[PDB]
């Protein structure tokens, strides 16, 4: 189609208007005196939601340029979510702030590509500074801490999470299943989790989680690449008449057999899914046997001659459940003998870090959680927030908590008061990020109907963990008042907003379709 | 789609206009000198109706923002209805009142989120105060009392209801069936009711009640979850050629067998429905056997080996009728032997509160009512109002009656004259609810063509149960004049209006589709 | 859809405009110097008609509010017709009059709901007063009297009607069939009529009468409810190959067998119809046997074991004709033996009021009428007017005649000159009905091109039955000049107009779809 | 001419919008980090000015009601000027503040004529209190100071006026005209 092209200031004013519409809709939900947004859906009833990414994903504008603005910032809130699990509003609010302040400088005659270098440097430093402040996140306290936070105040949540890790460890494998009743349930049962995602978004049966939940399925363990679909029918027809679903772990699954399986589930007979075997080369040889042992199945190897055509139900493994998402597969309760698994444990124990990881995965079991609730809505809803929190937590653990209320950010801004760049434009670029670092605190206060600059002035008069408690309307030590954000989320908010807004301010020309 | 977004006052003026259109259409029906509203329906002839929720559910506006207003208040009238069975107009009128007064304060510079806290506190207190005033609702008087009221003055109604409970008790199980002739009929026959709703709105054969009525059907009693549909065909084909419908009680029915059954009734051969078995864990084991005994059927247990494939008609139970709705299942006249049921009674009697509940349900029978009427219209129409009243009554019983004419509300408003909050905005928020509490009385009077403030002044000059009798145009003791509202309804009106309007006034921005 | 809502005066001016358009189109046909209205019909040729209801049923307006006006008054003319058979124009003209005068008072500041109470009281009194004036309608004179009138002057009509009743009695059963030639024919033959209408408007084969005429059909007499259609095929296939139609009398016919039969006639093989058996309980047991005896059929009882599957043609009854309408079934010329019927007569004669009614129906036969005519048009047309008249007559008999020219009404208006209500608004409400009572006379005169108020003044100067003879243009005694209206029609006109217009004037708000 | 008449809240929202436009244009010049306003004049070249009354006298709005708002507050800045000679911006900024806060209370259900009595009483008291705080101002140093702040922080103008009053006396006149040179 013929394109519309806009230059310089015009392009930019439009781009910003876009950002604002999205930013403004997301902002209203930030903080304890945050309000909700209603999101239409022809489909079913509207949705009420506080969740920043959820509002973001729905904004699309009519003016094609404004649209482009919104479609870009939408990525910060989106990315935050995939990494952290929370902070998507904060992320958005920082991004809008850097942009506003950025473009103001660009309009001053500053060189955008330098303003960007400044912003980026300011951020690399803020990230370092946050690692310092974080206390870390180790003890079950900090854990249920961050958890309950990312779970949105709900302490019961951060709780189970801490308990969980406190059971199978910080690296243990935790999962989530809908609760049968009103009570939450944490159980440890014979499992494993590895870093492999689905081979097609078309296997998703739970659109909500964006995941693949399968009920007591068989597991196929193939050593070769799967291109042709002919060697599938002997087994794929035996598990058709067994009523149950089927999981495929192989070197890969190529377009030919994949695309047939893809349309074979959605709209099709047997509902199945497939994922690449973990690791590569010599690891996946033994790493795949690990799964075989756990599930009580057989590995179809090429070096023994075994082919897929010469395989039965008996050769397959089994579990009571399994969940696959974008990049994670986790199996729960393997039918594998206690003798067989313990035998393979002693085998590796005998056999230093890479073998240690295989022991940890295997010996070890998988912890499960059943989100209890009164209503099926809340139920599955709560279940959601859980998986979220869990995320941040794992991340929080890997890299802790910091003072909430966005004080952490305000604190790093004064530490970097003396940061400079290679030239004056880079300097303004730093001051632009620092000034933005105040925005979460500033929005939190503004959503309470209170003077945001007056609160900020007095928090900035303080030190360490002194902050504003928006709930109770009085100042104090944020960690003592239990207002903690997880470090991974605060960091991640910052990195992502900076990344997008950094690029965004360097825009001199925009190219889109005609109205 | 591209969205329209409106801020602050503009958003709010539009939101209110919406509320008014709906409120105004509902208001005209409040009280004894209430008039009717005509509701178009391409479908059949138009509908004449006084029933507040019925008017509400039809309002949809063209201006997309105004629409949003109306679509939200529509929920108070809707919620009132699902809980109470009456008071939907009152509910609506209170909601419109809180909103009007609210937004006026918001426009004064008050902090909405505080006005909300005030309103809410004022309400929590009004609810307490109403519990005090209620006399309760216990004696068959108060019962037929509230009944006849919620039935819309019709004394004959409140009557049978009192009789009913007076038969199988307040907790007894009462049902309703269309009358064969012109006479009402109350009969007690060999039944049970438990807290479980249909597994899909697609089983509804009576669109009016929003329920599932089934004629002398067989009952299937399964101990396991029902996912696959293959174990269904041996029995589902034997009851296909028996001409009769079939009820399924199992641990659950999963999408796979559910979705097949769903399209198998509407547009399909055998008309069936399914509901989850009552309770959970060890209760539903024996609780399901209770039903088996009553219906003269067999429980298909897993721990005995019995599967659904190895089951006949003989294994199934039977009743003369059964009605399922949103969250209630009730079976009527079980074919179960008098010996078998009495034997199971003595079994539990031997076996303290949870077992007591199972005795009550079982021993005991189910009372039925046949709404008599001249015309089939009135007939089924009257039948409706009945089920309504019955509701409120059960509720009234659980938590009585209060002075009608909306005097109860006016009375609690003076009791709370001294209620205060945490700050001045919270105070205005209280005064806003109190002032609203006068509105039902004020509308009742306004629908009579009389001076509403002059009536209110003089009712507020009085005490206790002194009120205005709009029918006869003179003041007096409302309980003595027989003008009683059920407590549960007055309470419920208030709680729901407050809930919605409370949220509504905190609105600073609105996001909808383009015109 | 988005709705338009109008308030107060605006709503009302529009509502009235609607009424007028319909009223004005109907008015032009009132009285002996009434003119015709032409009614388009894409379908066939246009229709010329004097018949008030026929004009009414065609008015639909474009302005959605005006439409609502017309769609409401349309009900008076419609209701008149269903009860009386005549007077539909009068009804309409009164209704328009009450409305006009009403709304004028509402605009004076009067309280509508009181104006209504007045109107209603004035009417309850006018009805009483008319019962007084009626002379009654008993002798064959008054009968052919009212008949010939409601038949529109046609004396030949009122004639046969009187003859008829003079044959099988006032309660005898009279029917109508198209005439074979040009001569009218009255014949008495071996029949019965009971108060039961068709079980679906979809059995109608004569769209004109809105009835179900069936030619020498078989009669099925079932004791049970008919839900399933399987027990139908043994008999329904034997009467398929007998070429003739089939009538079903049973306890009921439920949706399942009904909906199959419904589409099985229109668009289908065997043309059949079904009606509920007369009475209830113990009556319908013997009351159904009565029909069996008359038709020479067998009753398929449950208490003998007989099922519908085990039934032949031989078991069924037969008649030469049968007509079913909205609420009446009447069978004509039963094949039942003279011995069998006389035997059942002696059986009941032996066996006090309820058994007396069964004797009357049975012993007794059914009188038939064949409307003779030159053209098939006139023929079937005349046939129509007949059935009409017959109606009013039966009614006239049950509750006589009064002075035509609308003098009766003018006479009751002076009798009620001293009627008062509970307050002044109720008083105006009475004067509003009284003043309206003059309108028929006033329109009759206006359609003659003469001064309506001058005629009215001089009729009101007179007494008793003195009136204006519009045909001959001179005053006199209306009963002596043969200008009589039947009481039932005059009463019914009044009651219905009052009913609708009473409601209509209480309208403060109107809600409809957007243009 | 036919008149437009507006009531209650509508009248008031419009009246306020008027006040704001004038207030906002005058406000930007208040204080040492005050900026200038440019005032068109078909007549000659435009005028640059910091002087609050000068901006005020030029505001006239198109919406006839908003106009009325502005035309009324314009009188505070105008009156200040005729009496004092300075403070016209301050005057304007106070006036806009009382109004904003006032109308907010009126919208709360307060009785306007009482809000007025309060305001007036508060002011009669503030005037008394200021008489107290004032230290008289009689020494050349103090005089030079008011002069300086008046002249947007220009020490020379202060000094120059202080010197002037010192020489002519109290019962003596000082005029100001265009000079030839730069100083």
From Swiss-Prot, chain D:
Protein's name according to its UniProt entry: Chaperonin GroEL
Processing after translation: Phosphorylated reversibly during heat shock.
Encoding gene per record: groEL
Family per record: Belongs to the chaperonin (HSP60) family.
Role: Together with its co-chaperonin GroES, plays an essential role in assisting protein folding. The GroEL-GroES system forms a nano-cage that allows encapsulation of the non-native substrate proteins and provides a physical environment optimized to promote and accelerate protein folding, probably by preventing aggregation and by entropically destabilizing folding intermediates. Also plays a role in coupling between replication of the F plasmid and cell division of the cell.
Entry remark concerning the domains of this protein: Each subunit is composed of an apical domain that binds non-folded proteins and GroES, an intermediate domain and an equatorial domain that binds ATP and is involved in inter-ring interactions. Forms a large central channel that appears to traverse the entire length of the cylinder with no obstruction. The central channel of GroEL functions as two cavities, one in each ring, that are separated from each other by the crystallographically disordered 23-amino-acid C-terminal segments of the seven subunits. The entry and exit of polypeptide seem to be restricted to the apical end of each ring.
Lineage of the species this protein comes from: Bacteria, Pseudomonadati, Pseudomonadota, Gammaproteobacteria, Enterobacterales
Modified residues (N6-succinyllysine): 33, 50, 116
Impact after mutating residue 1 to S: Complex stability is significantly decreased.tuberculosis
UniProt modified residues of type N6-acetyllysine: 116
Subcellular location as annotated: Cytoplasm
């Amino acid at each position: 189609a013929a394109k519309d092209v806009k230059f310089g200031n015009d392009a930019r004013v439009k781009m910003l208007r876009g950002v604002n519409v999205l930013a403004d809709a997301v902002k209203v939900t930030l903080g304890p005196k945050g309000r909700n947004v209603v999101l239409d859906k022809s489909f079913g009833a509207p949705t009420i939601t506080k969740d920043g990414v959820s509002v973001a994903r729905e904004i699309e504008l009519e003016d094609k340029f404004e649209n482009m603005g919104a479609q870009m910032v939408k990525e910060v809130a989106s990315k935050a979510n995939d990494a952290a699990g929370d902070g998507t509003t904060t992320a958005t609010v920082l991004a809008q702030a850097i942009i506003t302040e950025g473009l103001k400088a660009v309009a001053a005659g500053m060189n955008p590509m330098d303003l960007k270098r400044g912003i980026d440097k300011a951020v690399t430093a803020a990230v370092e500074e946050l690692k310092a402040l974080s206390v870390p996140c180790s003890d079950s306290k900090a854990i249920a801490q961050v958890g309950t936070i990312s779970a949105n105040s709900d302490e019961t949540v951060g709780k189970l999470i801490a308990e969980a890790m406190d059971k199978v460890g910080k690296e243990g494998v935790i999962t989530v299943e809908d609760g049968t009743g009103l009570q939450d349930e944490l159980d440890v049962v014979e499992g494993m989790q590895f870093d492999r995602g689905y081979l097609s978004p078309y296997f998703i049966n739970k659109p909500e989680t964006g995941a693949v939940e399968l009920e007591s399925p068989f597991i196929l363990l193939a050593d070769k690449k799967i291109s042709n679909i002919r060697e599938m029918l002997p087994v794929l027809e035996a598990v058709a008449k067994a009523g149950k679903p089927l999981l495929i772990i192989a070197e890969d699954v190529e377009g030919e057999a994949l695309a047939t399986l893809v349309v074979n589930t959605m709209r099709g007979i047997v509902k199945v899914a497939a994922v690449k075997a973990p690791g590569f080369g010599d690891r996946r040889k033994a790493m795949l046997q690990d799964i075989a042992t756990l599930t009580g199945g057989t590995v179809i190897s090429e070096e023994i001659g075994m082919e897929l055509e010469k395989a039965t139900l008996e050769d397959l493994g089994q579990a009571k459940r399994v969940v696959i998402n974008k990049d994670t597969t986790t199996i729960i309760d393997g039918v594998g003998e206690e003798a067989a698994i313990q035998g393979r444990v002693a085998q590796i124990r005998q056999q230093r870090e890479k073998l240690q990881e295989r022991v940890a995965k295997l010996a070890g079991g998988v912890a499960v959680i059943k989100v209890g609730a009164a209503t099926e809505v809340e139920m599955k809803e709560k279940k959601a927030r859980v998986e979220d929190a869990l995320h941040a937590t794992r991340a929080a653990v890997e890299e802790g908590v910091v003072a909430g209320g966005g004080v952490a950010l305000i604190r790093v801004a004064s530490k970097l008061a003396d940061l400079r760049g290679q030239n004056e434009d880079q300097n303004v670029g730093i001051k632009v990020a620092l000034r933005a670092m105040e925005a979460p605190l500033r929005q939190i206060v503004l959503n309470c109907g209170e003077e945001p600059s007056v609160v900020a002035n007095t928090v900035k008069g303080g030190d360490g963990n002194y902050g504003y408690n928006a709930a109770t309307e009085e100042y104090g030590n944020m960690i003592d008042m239990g207002i903690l954000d997880p470090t991974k989320v605060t960091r991640s908010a910052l990195q992502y907003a900076a990344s997008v807004a950094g690029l965004m301010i360097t825009t001199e020309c925009m190219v889109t379709d005609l109205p």
